[PDB]
CSV table of C-alpha atoms and ligand atoms in Angstrom, one decimal:
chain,number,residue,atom,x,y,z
W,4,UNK,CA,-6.4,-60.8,-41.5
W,5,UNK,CA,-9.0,-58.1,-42.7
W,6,UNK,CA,-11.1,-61.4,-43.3
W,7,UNK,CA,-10.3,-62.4,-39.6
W,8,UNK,CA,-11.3,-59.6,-38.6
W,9,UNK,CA,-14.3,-59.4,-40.2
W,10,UNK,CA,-15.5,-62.6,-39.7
W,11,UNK,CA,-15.0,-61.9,-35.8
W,12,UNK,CA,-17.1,-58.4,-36.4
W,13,UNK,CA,-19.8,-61.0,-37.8
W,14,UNK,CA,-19.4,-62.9,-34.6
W,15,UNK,CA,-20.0,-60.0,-32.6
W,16,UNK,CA,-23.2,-58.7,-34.3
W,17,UNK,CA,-24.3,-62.6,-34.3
W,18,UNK,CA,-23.5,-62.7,-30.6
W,19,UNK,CA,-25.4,-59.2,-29.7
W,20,UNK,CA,-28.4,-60.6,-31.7
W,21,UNK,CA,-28.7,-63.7,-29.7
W,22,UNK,CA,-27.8,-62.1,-26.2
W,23,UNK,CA,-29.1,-59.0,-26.1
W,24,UNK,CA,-32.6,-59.9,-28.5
W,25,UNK,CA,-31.6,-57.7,-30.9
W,26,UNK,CA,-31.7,-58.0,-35.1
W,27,UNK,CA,-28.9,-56.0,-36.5
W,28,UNK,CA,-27.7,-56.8,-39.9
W,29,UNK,CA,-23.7,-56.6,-40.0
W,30,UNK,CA,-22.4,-54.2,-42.8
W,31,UNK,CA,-18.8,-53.9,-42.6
W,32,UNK,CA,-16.2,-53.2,-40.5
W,33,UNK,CA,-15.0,-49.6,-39.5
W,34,UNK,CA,-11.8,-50.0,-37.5
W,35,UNK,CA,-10.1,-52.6,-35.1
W,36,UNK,CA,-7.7,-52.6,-32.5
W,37,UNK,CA,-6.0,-55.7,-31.2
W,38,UNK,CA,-4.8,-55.8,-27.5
W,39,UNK,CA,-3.0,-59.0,-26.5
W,40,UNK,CA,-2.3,-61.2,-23.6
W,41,UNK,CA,0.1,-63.8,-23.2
W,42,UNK,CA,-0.2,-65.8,-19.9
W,43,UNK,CA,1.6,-68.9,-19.6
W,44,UNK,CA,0.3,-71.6,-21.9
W,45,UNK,CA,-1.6,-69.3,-23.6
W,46,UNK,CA,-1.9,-66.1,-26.5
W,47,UNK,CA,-5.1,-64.4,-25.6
W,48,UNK,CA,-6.3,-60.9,-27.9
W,49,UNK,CA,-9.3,-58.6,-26.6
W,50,UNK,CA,-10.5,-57.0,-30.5
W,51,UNK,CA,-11.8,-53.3,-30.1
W,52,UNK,CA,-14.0,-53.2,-33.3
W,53,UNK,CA,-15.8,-50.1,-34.6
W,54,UNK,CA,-18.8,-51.4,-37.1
W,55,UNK,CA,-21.6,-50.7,-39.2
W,56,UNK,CA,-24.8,-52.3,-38.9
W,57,UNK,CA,-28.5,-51.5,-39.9
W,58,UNK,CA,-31.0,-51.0,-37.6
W,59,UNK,CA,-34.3,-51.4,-38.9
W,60,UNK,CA,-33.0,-50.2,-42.1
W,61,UNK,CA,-30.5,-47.7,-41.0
W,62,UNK,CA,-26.6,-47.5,-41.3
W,63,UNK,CA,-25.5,-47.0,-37.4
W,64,UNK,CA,-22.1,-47.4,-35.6
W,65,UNK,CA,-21.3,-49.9,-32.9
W,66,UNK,CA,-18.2,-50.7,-30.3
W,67,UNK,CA,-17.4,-54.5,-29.7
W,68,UNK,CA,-15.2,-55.8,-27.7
W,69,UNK,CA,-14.5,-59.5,-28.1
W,70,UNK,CA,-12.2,-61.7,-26.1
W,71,UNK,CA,-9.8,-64.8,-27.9
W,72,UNK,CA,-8.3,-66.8,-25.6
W,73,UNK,CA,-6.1,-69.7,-27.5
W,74,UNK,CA,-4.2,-72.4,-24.7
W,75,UNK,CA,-2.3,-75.0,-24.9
W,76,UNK,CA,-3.8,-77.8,-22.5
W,77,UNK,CA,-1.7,-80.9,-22.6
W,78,UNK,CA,0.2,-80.2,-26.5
W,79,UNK,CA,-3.3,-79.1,-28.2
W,80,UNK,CA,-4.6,-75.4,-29.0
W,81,UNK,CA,-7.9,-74.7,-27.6
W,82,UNK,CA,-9.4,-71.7,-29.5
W,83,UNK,CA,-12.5,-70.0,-27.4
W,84,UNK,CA,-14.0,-66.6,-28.3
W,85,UNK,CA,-16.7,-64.3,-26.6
W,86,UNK,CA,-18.6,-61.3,-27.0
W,87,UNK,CA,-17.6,-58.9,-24.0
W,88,UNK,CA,-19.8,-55.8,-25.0
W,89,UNK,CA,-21.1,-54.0,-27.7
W,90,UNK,CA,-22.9,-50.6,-27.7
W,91,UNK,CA,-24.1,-47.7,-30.2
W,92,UNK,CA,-21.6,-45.7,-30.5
M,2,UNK,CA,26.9,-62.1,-19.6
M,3,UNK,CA,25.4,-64.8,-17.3
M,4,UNK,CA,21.6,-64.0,-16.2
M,5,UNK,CA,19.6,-66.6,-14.2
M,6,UNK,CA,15.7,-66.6,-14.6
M,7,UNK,CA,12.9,-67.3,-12.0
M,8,UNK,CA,9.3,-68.2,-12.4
M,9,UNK,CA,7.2,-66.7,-9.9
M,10,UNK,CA,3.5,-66.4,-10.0
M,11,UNK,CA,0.9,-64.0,-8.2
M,12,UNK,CA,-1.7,-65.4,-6.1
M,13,UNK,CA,-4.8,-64.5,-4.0
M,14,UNK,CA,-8.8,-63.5,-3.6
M,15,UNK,CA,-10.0,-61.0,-6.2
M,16,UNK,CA,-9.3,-57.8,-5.3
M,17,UNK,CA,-6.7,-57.8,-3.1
M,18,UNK,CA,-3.9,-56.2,-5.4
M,19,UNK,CA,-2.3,-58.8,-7.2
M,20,UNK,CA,-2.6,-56.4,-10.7
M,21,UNK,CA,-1.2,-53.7,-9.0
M,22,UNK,CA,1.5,-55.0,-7.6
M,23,UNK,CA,2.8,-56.8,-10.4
M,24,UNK,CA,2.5,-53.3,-12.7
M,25,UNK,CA,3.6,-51.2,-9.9
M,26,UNK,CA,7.6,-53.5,-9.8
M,27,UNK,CA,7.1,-53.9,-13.9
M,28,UNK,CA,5.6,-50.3,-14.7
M,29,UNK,CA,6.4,-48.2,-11.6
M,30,UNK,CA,3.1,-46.8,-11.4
M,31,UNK,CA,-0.2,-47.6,-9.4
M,32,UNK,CA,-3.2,-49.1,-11.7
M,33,UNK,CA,-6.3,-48.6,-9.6
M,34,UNK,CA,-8.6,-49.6,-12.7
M,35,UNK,CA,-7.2,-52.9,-14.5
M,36,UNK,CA,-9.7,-56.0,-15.4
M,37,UNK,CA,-10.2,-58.4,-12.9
M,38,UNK,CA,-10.5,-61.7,-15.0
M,39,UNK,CA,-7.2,-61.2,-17.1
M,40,UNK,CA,-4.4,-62.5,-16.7
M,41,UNK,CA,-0.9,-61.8,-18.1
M,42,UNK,CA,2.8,-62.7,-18.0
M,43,UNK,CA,5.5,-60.1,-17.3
M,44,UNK,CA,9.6,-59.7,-17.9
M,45,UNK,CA,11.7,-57.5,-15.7
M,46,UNK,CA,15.7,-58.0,-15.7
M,47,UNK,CA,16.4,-56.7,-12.3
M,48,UNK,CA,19.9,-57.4,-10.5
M,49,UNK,CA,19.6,-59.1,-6.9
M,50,UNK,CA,22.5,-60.1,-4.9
M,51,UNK,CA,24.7,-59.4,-7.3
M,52,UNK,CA,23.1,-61.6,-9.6
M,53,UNK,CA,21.4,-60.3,-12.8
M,54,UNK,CA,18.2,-61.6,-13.1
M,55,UNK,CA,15.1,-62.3,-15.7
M,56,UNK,CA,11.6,-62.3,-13.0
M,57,UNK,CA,9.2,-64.3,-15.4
M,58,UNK,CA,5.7,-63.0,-13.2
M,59,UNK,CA,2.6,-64.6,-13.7
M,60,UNK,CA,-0.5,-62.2,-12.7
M,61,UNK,CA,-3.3,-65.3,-11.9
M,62,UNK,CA,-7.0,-63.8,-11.8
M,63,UNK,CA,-8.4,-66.9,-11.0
M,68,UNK,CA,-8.9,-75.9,-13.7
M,69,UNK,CA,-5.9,-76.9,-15.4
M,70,UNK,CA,-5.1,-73.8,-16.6
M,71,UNK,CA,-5.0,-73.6,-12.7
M,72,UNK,CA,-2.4,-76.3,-12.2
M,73,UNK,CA,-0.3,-76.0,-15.4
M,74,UNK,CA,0.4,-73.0,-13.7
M,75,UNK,CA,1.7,-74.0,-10.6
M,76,UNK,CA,3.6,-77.2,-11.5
M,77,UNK,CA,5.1,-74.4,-13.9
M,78,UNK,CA,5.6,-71.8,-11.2
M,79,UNK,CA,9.0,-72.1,-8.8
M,80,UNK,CA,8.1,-69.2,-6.2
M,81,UNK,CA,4.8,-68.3,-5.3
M,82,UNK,CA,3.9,-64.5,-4.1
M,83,UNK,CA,0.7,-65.0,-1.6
M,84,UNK,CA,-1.5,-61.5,-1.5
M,85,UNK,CA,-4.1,-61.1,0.9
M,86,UNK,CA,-5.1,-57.2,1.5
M,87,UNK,CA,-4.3,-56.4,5.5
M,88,UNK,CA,-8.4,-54.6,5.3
M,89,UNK,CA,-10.3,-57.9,3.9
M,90,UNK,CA,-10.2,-61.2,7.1
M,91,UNK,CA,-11.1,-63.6,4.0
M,92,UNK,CA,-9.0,-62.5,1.6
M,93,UNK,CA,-6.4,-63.6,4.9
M,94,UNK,CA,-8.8,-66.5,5.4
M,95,UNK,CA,-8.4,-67.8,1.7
M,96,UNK,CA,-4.3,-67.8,2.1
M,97,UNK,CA,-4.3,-71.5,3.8
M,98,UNK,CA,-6.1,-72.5,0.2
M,99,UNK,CA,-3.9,-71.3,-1.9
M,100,UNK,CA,-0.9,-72.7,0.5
M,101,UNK,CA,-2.7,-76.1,0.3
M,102,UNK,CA,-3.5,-76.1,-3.3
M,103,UNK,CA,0.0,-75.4,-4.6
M,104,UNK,CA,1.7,-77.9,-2.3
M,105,UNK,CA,-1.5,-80.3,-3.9
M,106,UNK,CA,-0.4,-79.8,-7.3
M,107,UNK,CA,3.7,-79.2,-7.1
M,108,UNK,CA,3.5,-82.4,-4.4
M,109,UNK,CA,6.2,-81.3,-2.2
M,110,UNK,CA,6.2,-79.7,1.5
M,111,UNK,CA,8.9,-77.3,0.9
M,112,UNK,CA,7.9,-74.9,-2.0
M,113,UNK,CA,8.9,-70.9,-2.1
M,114,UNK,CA,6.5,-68.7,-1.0
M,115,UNK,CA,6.3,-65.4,0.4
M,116,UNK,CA,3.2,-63.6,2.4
M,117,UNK,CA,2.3,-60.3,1.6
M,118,UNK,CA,0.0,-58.0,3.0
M,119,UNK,CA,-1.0,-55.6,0.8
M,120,UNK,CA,-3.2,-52.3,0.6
M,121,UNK,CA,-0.9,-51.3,4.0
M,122,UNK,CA,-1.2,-47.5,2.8
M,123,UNK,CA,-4.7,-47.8,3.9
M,124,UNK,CA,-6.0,-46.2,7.6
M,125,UNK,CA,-8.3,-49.5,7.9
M,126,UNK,CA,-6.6,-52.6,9.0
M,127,UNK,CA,-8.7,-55.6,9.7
M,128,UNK,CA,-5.3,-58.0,9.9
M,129,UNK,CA,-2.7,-57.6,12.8
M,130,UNK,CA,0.9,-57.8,11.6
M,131,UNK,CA,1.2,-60.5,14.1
M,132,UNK,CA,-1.5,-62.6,12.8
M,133,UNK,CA,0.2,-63.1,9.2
M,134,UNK,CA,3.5,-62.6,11.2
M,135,UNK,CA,2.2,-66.2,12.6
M,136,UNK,CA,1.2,-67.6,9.9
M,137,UNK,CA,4.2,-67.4,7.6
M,138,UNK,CA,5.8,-68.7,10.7
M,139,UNK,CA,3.9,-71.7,11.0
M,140,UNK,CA,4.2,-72.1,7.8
M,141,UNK,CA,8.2,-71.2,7.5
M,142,UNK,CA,8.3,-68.4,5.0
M,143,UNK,CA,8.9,-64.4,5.4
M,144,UNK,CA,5.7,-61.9,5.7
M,145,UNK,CA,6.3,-58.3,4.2
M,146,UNK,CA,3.4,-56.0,3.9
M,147,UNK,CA,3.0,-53.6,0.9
M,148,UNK,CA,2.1,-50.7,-1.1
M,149,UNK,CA,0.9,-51.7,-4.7
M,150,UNK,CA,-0.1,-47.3,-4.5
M,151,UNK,CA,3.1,-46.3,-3.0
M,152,UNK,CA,4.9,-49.1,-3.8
M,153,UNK,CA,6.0,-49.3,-0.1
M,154,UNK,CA,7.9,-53.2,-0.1
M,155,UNK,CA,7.0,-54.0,-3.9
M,156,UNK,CA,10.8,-54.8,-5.0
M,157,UNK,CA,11.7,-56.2,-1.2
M,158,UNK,CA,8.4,-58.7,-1.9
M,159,UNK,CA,9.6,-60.1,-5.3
M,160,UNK,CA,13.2,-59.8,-4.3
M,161,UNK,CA,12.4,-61.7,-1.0
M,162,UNK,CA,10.5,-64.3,-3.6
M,163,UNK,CA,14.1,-64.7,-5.9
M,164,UNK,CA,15.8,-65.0,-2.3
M,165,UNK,CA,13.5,-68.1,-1.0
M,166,UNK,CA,13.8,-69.7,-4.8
M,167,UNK,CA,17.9,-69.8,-4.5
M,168,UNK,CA,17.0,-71.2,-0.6
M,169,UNK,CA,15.9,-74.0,-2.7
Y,201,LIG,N1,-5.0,-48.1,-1.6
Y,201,LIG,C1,-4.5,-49.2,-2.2
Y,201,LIG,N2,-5.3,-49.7,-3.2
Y,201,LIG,C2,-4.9,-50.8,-3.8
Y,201,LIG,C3,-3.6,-51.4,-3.6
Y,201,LIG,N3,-3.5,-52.5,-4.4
Y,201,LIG,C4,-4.6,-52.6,-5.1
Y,201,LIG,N4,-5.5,-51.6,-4.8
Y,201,LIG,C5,-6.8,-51.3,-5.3
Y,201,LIG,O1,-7.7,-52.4,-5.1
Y,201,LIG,C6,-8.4,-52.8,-6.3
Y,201,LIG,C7,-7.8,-54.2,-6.6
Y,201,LIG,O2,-6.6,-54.1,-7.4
Y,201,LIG,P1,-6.2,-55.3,-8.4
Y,201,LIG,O3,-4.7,-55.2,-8.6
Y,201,LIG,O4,-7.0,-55.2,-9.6
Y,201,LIG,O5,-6.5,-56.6,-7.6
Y,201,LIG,P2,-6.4,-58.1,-8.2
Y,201,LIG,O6,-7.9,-58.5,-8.3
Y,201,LIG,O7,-5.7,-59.0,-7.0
Y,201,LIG,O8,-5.6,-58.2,-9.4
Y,201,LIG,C8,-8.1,-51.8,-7.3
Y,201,LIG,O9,-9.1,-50.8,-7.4
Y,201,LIG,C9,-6.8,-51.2,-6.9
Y,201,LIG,O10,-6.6,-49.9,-7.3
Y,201,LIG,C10,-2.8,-50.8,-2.5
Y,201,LIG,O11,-1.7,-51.2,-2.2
Y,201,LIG,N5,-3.3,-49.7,-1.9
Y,202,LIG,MG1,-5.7,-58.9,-11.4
């Protein structure tokens, strides 16, 4: 789950690259906190994640927020994720 | 001990309380800040009647998410807020689109007007008063802040399920 989590970290810095023209290079991951949703049909987690990226070179801290929703339409799981913010810390 | 769970899910316009409600009967507390795109399922064993009871609430933000919901859902709370005319406007939507998808002229319901705290009023009590009578179901306005006919709204719901 550590590798979970970092691999959704990567996701976010991917994400804020592409969406917000931006070229950070993902370090590692600081801390994360998990909240979690559960609406029928569905198991749904918004990640808190405190990381470390370079920026042009140098070790910064960064917020993101990213959004899993997992449902169950007809008797199959469909997995989606998002980016919902990110910011310097 | 015997308990008897309902299904009931929240439904109306952005905006108009649906959130707050729900937290306020599971949480007893207004939320005047809560994300307007999530949606969650809530638990509350409450007794009603006599009867001890397990309200299964589904807070809707709003597909076939959409309908999984309602062929799901036995008693429907309908929120408009009595200082929006469209959130009021959208209710006959709503109305339609669950009898659409659950395919049956009689389903529980309940109209609420919410936000009633509030010195505005853009909705006469007699206008929803009407429509829950043309449409045959009970109208209570409410309080998500002071939480002014919360339990009698849900309660009300359980009532028009065991109609049923
Ligand atoms: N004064 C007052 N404000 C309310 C009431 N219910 C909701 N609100 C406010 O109206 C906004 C919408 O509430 P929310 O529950 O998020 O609406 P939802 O979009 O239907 O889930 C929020 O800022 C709430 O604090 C109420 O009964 N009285
Ligand atoms: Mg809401």
């Amino acid at each position: 789950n550590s590798l979970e989590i970092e691999e959704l970290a990567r996701f976010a810095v991917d994400e804020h690259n592409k969406k917000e023209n931006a070229l950070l290079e993902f370090v590692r991951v600081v801390k994360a906190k998990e909240q979690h949703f559960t609406p029928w049909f569905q198991r749904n987690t918004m990640y808190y994640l405190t990381l470390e990226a370079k920026d042009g070179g140098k070790k910064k801290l960064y917020e993101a927020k990213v959004w899993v929703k997992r449902i169950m339409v007809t008797d199959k799981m469909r997995n989606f994720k998002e980016l919902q913010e990110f910011k310097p810390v | 001990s015997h308990m008897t769970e309902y299904k009931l899910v929240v439904v109306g316009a952005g905006g108009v309380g649906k959130s707050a409600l729900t937290i306020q009967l599971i949480q007893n507390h207004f939320v005047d800040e809560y994300d307007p795109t999530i949606e969650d399922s809530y638990r509350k064993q409450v007794v009603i009647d006599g009867e001890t009871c397990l309200l299964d609430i589904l807070d809707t933000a709003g597909s076939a998410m959409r309908d999984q919901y309602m062929r799901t859902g036995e008693g429907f709370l309908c929120v408009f807020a009595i200082n929006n005319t469209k959130s009021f406007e959208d209710i006959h939507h709503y109305r339609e689109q669950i009898k659409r998808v659950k395919d049956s002229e009689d389903v529980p319901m309940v109209l609420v007007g919410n936000k009633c705290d509030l010195p505005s009023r853009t909705v006469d009590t007699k206008q929803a008063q009407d429509l829950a009578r043309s449409y045959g179901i009970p109208f209570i306005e409410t309080s998500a802040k002071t939480r002014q006919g919360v339990d009698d709204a849900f309660y009300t719901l359980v009532r028009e399920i065991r109609k049923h």
